Design a protein around this ligand. Structure first.
Ligand SMILES: *[C@H]1O[C@H](CO)[C@@H](O[C@@H]2O[C@H](CO)[C@@H](O[C@@H]3O[C@H](CO)[C@@H](O)[C@H](O)[C@H]3O)[C@H](O)[C@H]2O)[C@H](O)[C@H]1F
Ligand SMILES: [Ca+2]
Ligand SMILES: [Ca+2]
Ligand SMILES: [Ca+2]
Ligand SMILES: [Ca+2]
Ligand SMILES: [Ca+2]
Length: 302
């Protein structure tokens, strides 16, 4: 029903809108690395998230490094499973080329182009797909002007050859925080959004102001990763500040995906160790983070 209702998404003056030009705000979950916690990504768990949490988007985090796609491309099978489940469930899905330790997107540019050509050839005709071409550029030697923009200018045409209109999310500097630099030197493609990532135990007002600067430049922003913990994904749970961030995003209608759907023993994890991989979770199987995020999505669902 989500995709049936909104259909083809597009950007209109920095806003994510549906095929009728109305605002759309996606709220969902991101998987953790598919090479480690892929069992939590399947039709049943996605259906449970759709039906019990109210998600309207699912993010498949395909790490490139750290035992991911570069070393073992079989993980692509999990990405396809996720996309196919999202199509069957009628929700949106983000295919995330999840760079991190490989901090410059240009490290695996050829492989990225090849992967996105394949993904866009396979799924380019479905409105469900959103491509996220470089999770988190990072490092002092990696900037928008020198590394990220040019990378995007090479990958985007590859996708556009097969899929002229689906949304493309592009990572920004300093672990997808530097949306101000991107907003001052935007890509030409009309259907792009810049990623902004935050952790409630580490980031606050200064970064909210930075996002506002970017929005004031007409840039579209997708919060494709955010956590209730510290920036490491652990170090405690900060729901007071997480709610400040939630309100901030609602005021601005920013779409988001929470990190992350896993049973790993880290504060940002949504599930407790041993949680059922196919869903149907008891309240006891959700962590404090998970309980809170589920409420945030339910309280705005339908
Ligand atoms: C956005 O931020 C989050 C939070 O920092 C990042 O997610 C964290 O990524 C860590 C690095 O991949 C990950 O730790 C790794 O976990 C693996 C699976 O258990 C371990 O094998 C590995 O030793 C360890 O470094 C955190 O668990 C995870 O929250 C996310 O990648 C960024 F995009
Ligand atoms: Ca099955
Ligand atoms: Ca091709
Ligand atoms: Ca398309
Ligand atoms: Ca080039
Ligand atoms: Ca709204």
């Amino acid at each position: 029903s989500v995709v049936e209702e909104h259909g083809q998404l597009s950007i209109s003056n920095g806003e994510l809108v549906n095929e009728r030009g109305e605002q759309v705000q996606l709220k969902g979950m991101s998987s953790h690395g598919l090479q480690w916690y892929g069992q939590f990504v399947n039709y049943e768990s996605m259906k449970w998230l759709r039906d019990d949490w109210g998600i309207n988007v699912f993010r498949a985090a395909m790490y490139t490094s750290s035992g991911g796609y570069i070393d073992d491309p079989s993980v692509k099978e999990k990405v396809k499973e996720a996309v196919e489940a999202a199509i069957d469930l009628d929700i949106y899905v983000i295919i995330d080329w999840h760079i991190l330790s490989d901090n410059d997107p240009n490290i695996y540019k050829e492989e990225a182009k090849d992967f996105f050509d394949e993904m866009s050839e396979l799924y380019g005709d479905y409105p469900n797909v959103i491509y996220e071409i470089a999770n988190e550029p990072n490092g002092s030697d990696v900037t928008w002007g020198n590394q990220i923009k040019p990378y995007a200018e090479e990958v985007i045409p590859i996708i556009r050859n097969n899929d002229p209109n689906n949304i493309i999310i592009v990572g920004t500097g300093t672990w997808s925080q530097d949306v101000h630099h991107a907003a001052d030197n935007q890509l030409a493609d009309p259907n792009v959004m810049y990623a902004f990532h935050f952790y409630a135990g580490t980031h606050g007002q200064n970064l909210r102001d930075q996002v506002d600067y970017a929005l004031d430049q007409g840039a579209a922003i997708f919060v494709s990763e955010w956590g209730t913990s510290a920036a490491t994904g652990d170090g405690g749970v900060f729901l007071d500040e997480a709610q400040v961030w939630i309100d901030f995003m609602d005021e601005r209608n920013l779409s988001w995906a929470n990190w992350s759907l896993t049973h790993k023993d880290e504060s940002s994890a949504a599930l407790m160790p041993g949680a059922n991989p196919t869903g149907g979770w008891t309240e006891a199987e959700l962590s404090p983070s998970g309980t809170f995020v589920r409420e945030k999505i339910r309280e705005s669902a339908s």
